[PDB]
Design goal:
Blueprint lengths: L10 H22 L18
Protein backbone atom coordinates (compact mmCIF):
# COMPACT_ATOMS: atom_id res chain seq x y z
CA UNK A 1 0.00 0.00 0.00
CA UNK A 2 1.13 3.55 -0.81
CA UNK A 3 3.40 4.30 -3.78
CA UNK A 4 7.17 4.60 -3.81
CA UNK A 5 7.45 8.37 -3.60
CA UNK A 6 11.12 8.63 -2.67
CA UNK A 7 11.66 4.89 -2.29
CA UNK A 8 13.46 3.55 -5.37
CA UNK A 9 15.32 0.42 -6.43
CA UNK A 10 18.92 0.27 -7.78
CA UNK A 11 17.75 0.21 -11.40
CA UNK A 12 19.34 3.58 -12.10
CA UNK A 13 22.57 2.23 -10.61
CA UNK A 14 22.38 -0.61 -13.13
CA UNK A 15 21.79 1.74 -16.06
CA UNK A 16 24.65 3.86 -14.77
CA UNK A 17 26.81 0.76 -14.51
CA UNK A 18 26.26 -0.06 -18.16
CA UNK A 19 27.15 3.45 -18.99
CA UNK A 20 30.06 3.50 -16.58
CA UNK A 21 31.23 0.34 -18.38
CA UNK A 22 33.66 2.54 -20.30
CA UNK A 23 35.81 3.16 -17.23
CA UNK A 24 34.68 0.39 -14.88
CA UNK A 25 33.54 -2.39 -17.20
CA UNK A 26 36.64 -2.37 -19.36
CA UNK A 27 38.76 -2.00 -16.22
CA UNK A 28 37.91 -5.54 -15.19
CA UNK A 29 38.35 -6.81 -18.74
CA UNK A 30 41.66 -5.03 -18.99
CA UNK A 31 42.90 -6.25 -15.61
CA UNK A 32 41.50 -9.78 -15.75
CA UNK A 33 43.13 -10.48 -19.12
CA UNK A 34 46.38 -9.50 -17.41
CA UNK A 35 47.72 -7.18 -20.10
CA UNK A 36 50.62 -6.61 -17.72
CA UNK A 37 51.73 -10.10 -18.79
CA UNK A 38 52.46 -12.54 -15.98
CA UNK A 39 55.16 -14.59 -17.79
CA UNK A 40 58.40 -12.63 -17.87
CA UNK A 41 59.48 -14.37 -21.06
CA UNK A 42 56.83 -14.55 -23.80
CA UNK A 43 59.50 -13.57 -26.32
CA UNK A 44 61.10 -16.96 -25.79
CA UNK A 45 61.85 -19.79 -28.21
CA UNK A 46 60.56 -22.50 -25.86
CA UNK A 47 58.11 -21.89 -23.04
CA UNK A 48 54.46 -22.92 -23.18
CA UNK A 49 54.66 -25.53 -20.40
CA UNK A 50 54.51 -28.24 -23.05
Amino acid sequence: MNFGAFSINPAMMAAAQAALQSSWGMMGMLASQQNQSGPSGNNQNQGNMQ
